Amino acid sequence: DIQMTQSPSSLSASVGDRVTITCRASQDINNYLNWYQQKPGKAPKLLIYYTSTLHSGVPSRFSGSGSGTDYTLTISSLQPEDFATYYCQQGNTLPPTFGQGTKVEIKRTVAAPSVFIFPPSDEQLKSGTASVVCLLNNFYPREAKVQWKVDNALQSGNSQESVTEQDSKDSTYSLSSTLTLSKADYEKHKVYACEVTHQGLSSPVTKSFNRGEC
Amino acid sequence: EVQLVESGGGLVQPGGSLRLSCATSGYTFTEYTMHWMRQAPGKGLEWVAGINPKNGGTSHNQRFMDRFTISVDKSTSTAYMQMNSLRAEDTAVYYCARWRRYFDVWGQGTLVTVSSASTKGPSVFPLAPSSKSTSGGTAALGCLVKDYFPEPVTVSWNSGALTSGVHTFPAVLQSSGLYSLSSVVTVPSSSLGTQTYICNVNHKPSNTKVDKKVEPKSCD
């Protein structure tokens, strides 16, 4: 019943950098220090156990160090698939305790988004609603503005947005933005438009369609 | 090959009990210790309790040791955890994991969500691949999985054979109380009148399955 603390607990590094998350226990933990890796929405995997030993199939660029209350994880080359949260666990005293995890994000070269718009399904309009969807796809950085103009007229707070986690093989993102308004108000407007603005895009992309007649 | 599969999770009104099982394959049960973890959504891993098959020895994390209890069924190779007087703070994913000083094989998880809400099955809708003009080189179609509660919704394209180009976004709790999610893939434009695209939605808390066809064009 040792507090485990990791520092830092969010991190960005280009592919090929070394990385160092440290983990420090409130007590001499005697080298019973293991490191877990957990990909977004999976069980954690054991990389290193007993400060510096590797689990089977855990690649050489990962290593562990330390003693007493201080220990470190070092990935010596970031590879895009080291996108995970890593946790340290003490195995010295009951209960076993964990750190808060560190978030390693892979910093890479600007990708510009592929914008796509979907009109509302005739089925859904039958259920009394419409959900106009824009997909900004496979871009980088996570920062990109989206706005909805319904007949050349900015809309407000009637669009939620969702983002994916970073892609394992090529460190990019994807974002849905869904405007959603009733059948009655969809049916009383004509052009529907989605406006993306991002770093690697020299000018705002507008992706649009007709008919609030659907 | 070791399998730790856990189950039992789902919706619970506050005040109710739950019983999770953790089923084992591929090793002699009796030789390793079983432990239940918990991870509250977007947070740290917590420990909850431990059992030794061999003598039914049991450690219990004191914050939980009042309300949560552990059992093993030596014959059936199943670890269990009884959960009592669930408050909403215990909404989380629960993992079982094996071994003492480190857990080498872990489970897959089961989410217990404690909410006074009801369960609803989702209404899957097409995100219909609009005009091969705008969509030129690669088109993108998907399914809007609407209005469910509790989570999750699994989504698959083409009975698990379309695996590349798929993006299933995080679900948004909407205004509703109910969630909404989306899965989308990016196929070659070229392939639209040479193949059907089907999203397969399973939302297990209401064991709603639906396979939907996402076909061509859109508004009218």
Coordinates of C-alpha atoms in Angstrom, one line a residue:
Chain A
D1 CA 0.0 0.0 0.0
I2 CA 2.4 2.3 -1.6
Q3 CA 1.3 5.3 -3.7
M4 CA 2.7 4.8 -7.2
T5 CA 3.3 8.0 -9.2
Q6 CA 4.2 8.4 -12.8
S7 CA 5.7 11.4 -14.4
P8 CA 4.8 12.7 -16.7
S9 CA 1.4 11.5 -17.5
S10 CA 1.0 12.7 -21.0
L11 CA 3.7 12.7 -23.6
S12 CA 4.3 13.4 -27.3
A13 CA 7.2 12.1 -29.3
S14 CA 8.2 11.6 -32.8
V15 CA 8.8 8.3 -34.1
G16 CA 12.4 7.4 -33.4
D17 CA 12.8 9.5 -30.2
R18 CA 13.8 7.9 -26.8
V19 CA 11.0 8.2 -24.1
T20 CA 11.2 8.0 -20.4
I21 CA 8.2 7.7 -18.1
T22 CA 9.3 7.5 -14.5
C23 CA 7.5 5.8 -11.6
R24 CA 8.1 6.4 -8.1
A25 CA 6.8 4.5 -5.3
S26 CA 6.2 6.0 -1.7
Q27 CA 8.3 3.1 -0.3
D28 CA 11.1 0.9 -1.0
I29 CA 9.6 -1.5 -3.2
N30 CA 12.7 -3.7 -3.6
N31 CA 12.7 -3.9 -7.3
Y32 CA 9.2 -5.5 -7.5
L33 CA 8.4 -3.2 -10.2
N34 CA 6.5 -4.3 -13.3
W35 CA 5.4 -2.2 -16.3
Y36 CA 2.0 -2.9 -18.1
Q37 CA 1.0 -1.6 -21.6
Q38 CA -2.5 -0.9 -22.6
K39 CA -3.8 -0.1 -25.9
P40 CA -7.1 1.9 -25.9
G41 CA -9.9 -0.6 -25.1
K42 CA -7.9 -3.9 -24.4
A43 CA -6.5 -5.6 -21.2
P44 CA -3.1 -4.4 -20.1
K45 CA 0.0 -6.5 -21.3
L46 CA 3.0 -7.1 -19.1
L47 CA 6.1 -5.7 -20.7
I48 CA 8.8 -5.7 -18.0
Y49 CA 8.7 -7.4 -14.6
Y50 CA 11.0 -7.2 -11.7
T51 CA 12.3 -3.7 -12.6
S52 CA 14.3 -4.7 -15.7
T53 CA 13.3 -8.1 -17.1
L54 CA 11.4 -8.6 -20.3
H55 CA 8.2 -10.5 -20.9
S56 CA 8.2 -12.9 -23.8
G57 CA 7.9 -11.1 -27.2
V58 CA 8.3 -7.6 -25.7
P59 CA 10.7 -5.8 -28.0
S60 CA 14.2 -4.8 -27.2
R61 CA 13.7 -1.0 -27.3
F62 CA 11.8 -1.2 -24.0
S63 CA 13.9 -1.4 -20.8
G64 CA 13.4 -0.9 -17.1
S65 CA 15.7 0.6 -14.4
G66 CA 15.8 1.8 -10.8
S67 CA 15.7 0.7 -7.2
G68 CA 14.2 1.9 -3.9
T69 CA 11.5 4.3 -4.6
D70 CA 12.6 5.3 -8.1
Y71 CA 12.2 3.5 -11.4
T72 CA 12.1 4.3 -15.1
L73 CA 10.7 3.0 -18.5
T74 CA 12.6 3.9 -21.5
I75 CA 11.5 3.2 -25.1
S76 CA 14.6 3.9 -27.0
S77 CA 13.1 4.4 -30.4
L78 CA 9.4 5.4 -30.6
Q79 CA 7.6 3.2 -33.1
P80 CA 4.0 4.3 -34.0
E81 CA 2.6 1.2 -32.4
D82 CA 3.8 2.2 -28.9
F83 CA 0.8 4.4 -28.8
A84 CA -0.6 3.2 -25.4
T85 CA -1.0 4.2 -21.8
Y86 CA 1.8 2.5 -19.7
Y87 CA 1.3 1.7 -15.9
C88 CA 3.8 0.9 -13.2
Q89 CA 2.8 -1.6 -10.5
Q90 CA 4.5 -2.3 -7.2
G91 CA 4.5 -6.0 -6.3
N92 CA 6.0 -5.6 -2.8
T93 CA 3.0 -5.1 -0.4
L94 CA -0.7 -6.0 -0.4
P95 CA -2.7 -4.4 -2.0
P96 CA -0.7 -4.3 -5.3
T97 CA -0.9 -0.6 -6.5
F98 CA -0.6 1.1 -9.9
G99 CA 0.2 4.5 -11.2
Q100 CA -2.2 6.8 -13.0
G101 CA -0.7 5.7 -16.3
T102 CA 1.2 7.9 -18.8
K103 CA -0.3 8.7 -22.2
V104 CA 2.3 8.4 -25.1
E105 CA 1.2 10.2 -28.2
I106 CA 3.3 9.9 -31.5
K107 CA 4.1 13.3 -32.9
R108 CA 4.2 13.1 -36.7
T109 CA 4.1 15.3 -39.9
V110 CA 0.8 17.0 -40.8
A111 CA -1.8 15.0 -42.6
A112 CA -4.7 16.9 -44.0
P113 CA -8.2 15.6 -43.6
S114 CA -10.4 13.9 -46.2
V115 CA -13.9 15.5 -45.6
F116 CA -17.1 13.5 -46.5
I117 CA -20.8 14.5 -45.8
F118 CA -23.7 12.0 -45.4
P119 CA -27.4 13.2 -45.8
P120 CA -30.0 11.9 -43.5
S121 CA -31.3 8.3 -44.2
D122 CA -35.0 8.2 -45.4
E123 CA -35.7 5.7 -42.6
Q124 CA -34.4 8.0 -39.8
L125 CA -36.5 11.0 -41.2
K126 CA -39.5 8.6 -40.9
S127 CA -38.6 8.4 -37.1
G128 CA -39.1 12.2 -36.7
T129 CA -35.3 13.2 -36.8
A130 CA -32.3 13.9 -39.1
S131 CA -28.6 13.4 -38.5
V132 CA -26.5 15.0 -41.0
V133 CA -22.9 13.7 -40.5
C134 CA -19.5 15.2 -41.7
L135 CA -16.4 12.8 -41.4
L136 CA -13.0 14.4 -41.3
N137 CA -10.8 11.4 -42.1
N138 CA -7.3 10.5 -41.5
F139 CA -5.7 13.8 -40.6
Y140 CA -3.1 15.0 -38.1
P141 CA -3.0 17.1 -35.6
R142 CA -6.2 16.5 -33.5
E143 CA -6.9 20.2 -33.9
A144 CA -9.3 21.1 -36.8
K145 CA -12.4 23.4 -36.8
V146 CA -15.8 22.2 -38.1
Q147 CA -18.9 24.3 -38.6
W148 CA -22.3 23.8 -40.0
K149 CA -23.9 26.2 -42.2
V150 CA -27.6 25.4 -43.1
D151 CA -28.3 27.6 -46.0
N152 CA -25.1 29.7 -45.6
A153 CA -25.9 30.3 -42.0
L154 CA -23.9 29.2 -39.0
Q155 CA -25.6 26.8 -36.7
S156 CA -25.2 26.4 -33.0
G157 CA -24.8 23.8 -30.4
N158 CA -26.8 21.2 -32.2
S159 CA -23.8 19.2 -33.3
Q160 CA -21.8 16.8 -31.2
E161 CA -18.4 15.6 -32.4
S162 CA -16.4 12.4 -31.7
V163 CA -12.7 11.7 -32.2
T164 CA -10.8 8.4 -32.6
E165 CA -7.6 7.5 -30.8
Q166 CA -4.4 7.7 -32.7
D167 CA -3.9 5.1 -35.3
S168 CA -1.5 2.4 -34.6
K169 CA 0.1 2.1 -38.0
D170 CA 0.2 5.8 -39.1
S171 CA -0.4 8.0 -36.1
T172 CA -3.4 9.9 -37.4
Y173 CA -7.0 10.9 -36.3
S174 CA -10.6 10.8 -37.5
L175 CA -13.5 12.9 -36.3
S176 CA -17.3 12.6 -36.8
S177 CA -19.4 15.8 -36.3
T178 CA -23.1 15.1 -36.3
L179 CA -25.7 17.9 -36.8
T180 CA -29.0 16.8 -35.7
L181 CA -32.3 18.5 -36.0
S182 CA -35.9 17.4 -36.4
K183 CA -37.5 16.3 -39.6
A184 CA -39.7 19.5 -39.6
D185 CA -36.6 21.8 -39.5
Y186 CA -34.5 19.7 -41.9
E187 CA -37.5 19.9 -44.3
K188 CA -37.4 23.7 -44.2
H189 CA -33.9 24.4 -45.4
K190 CA -32.1 23.5 -48.6
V191 CA -28.2 23.5 -48.7
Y192 CA -26.4 21.8 -45.8
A193 CA -22.7 22.4 -45.3
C194 CA -19.7 21.3 -43.4
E195 CA -16.6 23.6 -43.1
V196 CA -13.2 22.2 -42.2
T197 CA -10.2 24.1 -41.3
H198 CA -6.9 22.4 -40.3
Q199 CA -3.2 23.1 -40.5
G200 CA -2.2 21.1 -43.5
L201 CA -5.2 22.4 -45.6
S202 CA -4.3 25.7 -47.4
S203 CA -7.9 26.9 -47.3
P204 CA -11.2 25.6 -45.5
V205 CA -12.9 22.7 -47.2
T206 CA -16.7 23.0 -47.6
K207 CA -18.5 19.8 -48.3
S208 CA -22.2 20.2 -48.9
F209 CA -25.6 19.0 -50.3
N210 CA -29.1 20.0 -51.2
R211 CA -32.5 19.0 -50.0
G212 CA -34.4 19.3 -46.9
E213 CA -36.7 17.4 -49.1
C214 CA -35.6 13.8 -48.0
Chain B
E1 CA -3.3 -21.0 -24.5
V2 CA -4.9 -19.4 -21.6
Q3 CA -8.4 -17.8 -21.9
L4 CA -9.7 -15.5 -19.2
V5 CA -13.2 -14.5 -20.2
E6 CA -15.4 -12.5 -17.8
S7 CA -19.1 -11.9 -18.0
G8 CA -22.2 -10.8 -15.9
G9 CA -21.7 -7.1 -16.3
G10 CA -24.5 -4.9 -17.6
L11 CA -26.9 -2.2 -16.2
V12 CA -27.7 -2.3 -12.4
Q13 CA -30.0 0.2 -10.7
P14 CA -28.1 1.7 -7.7
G15 CA -28.7 -0.6 -4.7
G16 CA -28.6 -3.8 -6.7
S17 CA -26.2 -6.7 -6.7
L18 CA -24.3 -8.3 -9.6
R19 CA -22.2 -11.5 -10.1
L20 CA -19.3 -11.5 -12.4
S21 CA -17.7 -14.7 -13.5
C22 CA -14.3 -15.1 -15.0
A23 CA -14.0 -18.3 -16.9
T24 CA -10.6 -20.1 -17.4
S25 CA -9.1 -22.3 -20.2
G26 CA -5.6 -23.7 -21.1
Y27 CA -3.9 -24.1 -17.7
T28 CA -4.3 -26.0 -14.3
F29 CA -6.5 -23.8 -12.3
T30 CA -5.3 -24.7 -9.0
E31 CA -1.8 -23.6 -9.7
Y32 CA -2.3 -19.9 -10.1
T33 CA -4.1 -17.2 -8.1
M34 CA -7.0 -15.2 -9.5
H35 CA -7.5 -11.5 -8.9
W36 CA -10.2 -9.1 -10.0
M37 CA -9.2 -5.7 -11.3
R38 CA -11.4 -2.7 -12.0
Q39 CA -10.7 0.3 -14.2
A40 CA -13.1 3.3 -13.9
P41 CA -13.7 4.8 -17.5
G42 CA -10.7 6.9 -18.4
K43 CA -8.7 6.3 -15.2
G44 CA -6.3 4.0 -13.3
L45 CA -6.3 0.3 -12.7
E46 CA -7.5 -0.7 -9.1
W47 CA -7.1 -4.1 -7.4
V48 CA -10.3 -5.6 -5.8
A49 CA -9.7 -9.1 -4.4
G50 CA -7.7 -12.4 -4.8
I51 CA -8.3 -16.2 -4.2
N52 CA -6.0 -19.2 -4.2
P53 CA -7.8 -22.2 -5.9
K54 CA -5.7 -24.6 -3.8
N55 CA -7.0 -23.4 -0.3
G56 CA -9.6 -20.9 -0.9
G57 CA -7.4 -18.3 0.6
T58 CA -8.7 -14.8 0.1
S59 CA -7.3 -11.2 0.2
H60 CA -9.8 -8.3 -0.3
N61 CA -9.0 -4.6 -1.0
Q62 CA -10.3 -2.9 2.1
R63 CA -12.4 -0.2 0.4
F64 CA -14.3 -2.8 -1.3
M65 CA -13.9 -5.5 1.3
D66 CA -17.2 -4.5 2.9
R67 CA -19.3 -4.8 -0.3
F68 CA -17.5 -7.1 -2.8
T69 CA -16.8 -10.9 -2.2
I70 CA -14.9 -13.5 -4.2
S71 CA -15.6 -17.2 -4.9
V72 CA -14.0 -19.8 -7.1
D73 CA -15.7 -22.9 -8.4
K74 CA -12.9 -25.3 -8.5
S75 CA -14.6 -27.7 -10.8
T76 CA -15.8 -25.2 -13.3
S77 CA -12.6 -23.1 -13.3
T78 CA -14.5 -20.0 -12.7
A79 CA -13.6 -17.1 -10.5
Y80 CA -16.6 -15.0 -9.4
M81 CA -17.1 -11.8 -7.8
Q82 CA -20.3 -10.9 -5.9
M83 CA -20.9 -7.2 -6.0
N84 CA -23.3 -5.6 -3.4
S85 CA -24.9 -2.2 -2.9
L86 CA -23.6 -0.8 -6.1
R87 CA -23.2 2.9 -6.0
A88 CA -22.5 4.7 -9.4
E89 CA -18.9 5.3 -8.5
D90 CA -18.5 1.5 -9.3
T91 CA -19.4 1.9 -12.9
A92 CA -16.2 0.5 -14.5
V93 CA -14.7 -2.2 -16.5
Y94 CA -13.7 -5.3 -14.4
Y95 CA -10.9 -7.5 -15.5
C96 CA -9.8 -10.7 -13.9
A97 CA -6.1 -11.5 -14.0
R98 CA -3.9 -14.4 -13.1
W99 CA -0.8 -14.9 -10.9
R100 CA 0.6 -13.4 -7.7
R101 CA 4.7 -10.9 -8.3
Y102 CA 2.9 -9.7 -11.5
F103 CA -0.2 -10.5 -13.6
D104 CA 0.9 -12.2 -16.8
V105 CA -2.4 -13.1 -18.5
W106 CA -5.4 -10.7 -18.1
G107 CA -9.0 -10.9 -19.1
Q108 CA -10.9 -8.9 -21.7
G109 CA -13.2 -7.0 -19.4
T110 CA -16.9 -6.7 -18.6
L111 CA -18.4 -3.2 -17.9
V112 CA -20.7 -2.7 -15.0
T113 CA -22.7 0.4 -15.4
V114 CA -24.9 1.5 -12.5
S115 CA -27.5 4.0 -13.6
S116 CA -31.1 4.5 -12.7
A117 CA -31.8 4.6 -16.4
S118 CA -33.5 1.7 -18.5
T119 CA -31.8 -0.3 -21.2
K120 CA -32.7 0.5 -24.9
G121 CA -31.8 -1.3 -28.0
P122 CA -30.3 0.9 -30.8
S123 CA -31.7 1.9 -34.1
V124 CA -29.0 1.4 -36.8
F125 CA -29.3 3.8 -39.8
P126 CA -27.3 4.0 -43.2
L127 CA -24.6 6.5 -43.8
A128 CA -25.2 6.1 -47.5
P129 CA -22.3 6.6 -49.9
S130 CA -23.2 9.7 -51.7
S131 CA -22.6 10.3 -55.4
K132 CA -19.5 8.9 -57.1
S133 CA -18.3 12.3 -58.2
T134 CA -17.8 13.9 -54.8
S135 CA -16.6 10.5 -53.6
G136 CA -13.9 10.1 -56.3
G137 CA -11.0 7.6 -55.8
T138 CA -12.3 6.5 -52.4
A139 CA -15.9 6.6 -51.1
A140 CA -16.9 6.2 -47.6
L141 CA -20.1 4.8 -46.2
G142 CA -21.0 3.7 -42.7
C143 CA -23.8 3.0 -40.0
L144 CA -25.2 5.4 -37.5
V145 CA -26.0 3.3 -34.4
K146 CA -28.6 5.4 -32.6
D147 CA -30.1 5.7 -29.2
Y148 CA -29.0 3.0 -27.0
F149 CA -28.2 2.6 -23.4
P150 CA -26.0 1.0 -21.5
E151 CA -22.8 0.6 -23.5
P152 CA -21.5 -1.4 -25.6
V153 CA -22.3 -1.6 -29.2
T154 CA -19.9 -3.8 -31.3
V155 CA -19.8 -3.0 -35.0
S156 CA -18.5 -5.1 -37.9
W157 CA -18.3 -4.9 -41.5
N158 CA -19.1 -7.8 -43.6
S159 CA -19.3 -10.4 -40.9
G160 CA -15.7 -9.6 -39.8
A161 CA -14.1 -9.7 -43.2
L162 CA -13.9 -5.9 -43.7
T163 CA -11.5 -4.9 -41.1
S164 CA -9.3 -2.3 -42.9
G165 CA -10.6 1.3 -43.4
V166 CA -13.2 0.9 -40.5
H167 CA -13.5 3.7 -37.9
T168 CA -15.8 3.1 -35.1
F169 CA -15.9 6.3 -33.2
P170 CA -16.4 6.7 -29.4
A171 CA -20.0 6.9 -28.5
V172 CA -21.4 10.3 -27.4
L173 CA -23.9 10.3 -24.5
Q174 CA -26.4 12.6 -26.3
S175 CA -28.9 15.0 -24.8
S176 CA -31.3 12.2 -24.6
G177 CA -29.5 10.3 -21.8
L178 CA -29.1 7.8 -24.7
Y179 CA -25.9 7.3 -26.7
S180 CA -25.2 7.5 -30.4
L181 CA -22.1 6.0 -32.2
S182 CA -20.8 5.5 -35.8
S183 CA -18.8 3.1 -37.7
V184 CA -17.5 4.1 -41.1
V185 CA -15.3 2.4 -43.8
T186 CA -13.5 3.6 -46.9
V187 CA -13.8 1.5 -49.7
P188 CA -12.9 2.1 -53.4
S189 CA -15.5 4.0 -55.3
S190 CA -15.0 1.5 -58.1
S191 CA -16.4 -1.3 -56.0
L192 CA -19.8 0.1 -55.2
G193 CA -21.8 -1.9 -58.0
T194 CA -19.7 -5.0 -57.6
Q195 CA -20.3 -5.4 -53.8
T196 CA -22.7 -4.9 -50.9
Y197 CA -21.5 -3.5 -47.7
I198 CA -23.0 -4.7 -44.4
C199 CA -22.6 -3.3 -40.9
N200 CA -23.4 -5.8 -38.2
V201 CA -24.5 -4.2 -35.0
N202 CA -24.6 -6.2 -31.7
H203 CA -25.8 -4.4 -28.6
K204 CA -25.7 -7.1 -26.0
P205 CA -27.5 -5.4 -22.9
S206 CA -30.7 -5.8 -25.0
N207 CA -29.2 -8.5 -27.2
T208 CA -30.1 -6.6 -30.3
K209 CA -28.4 -7.7 -33.3
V210 CA -28.9 -6.1 -36.7
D211 CA -27.2 -6.5 -40.0
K212 CA -27.7 -3.5 -42.3
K213 CA -27.1 -2.9 -45.9
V214 CA -25.4 0.4 -46.7
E215 CA -26.2 1.0 -50.4
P216 CA -25.6 3.9 -52.8
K217 CA -26.5 7.6 -53.4
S218 CA -28.7 9.5 -50.6
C219 CA -31.1 12.6 -50.4
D220 CA -34.6 12.8 -52.1

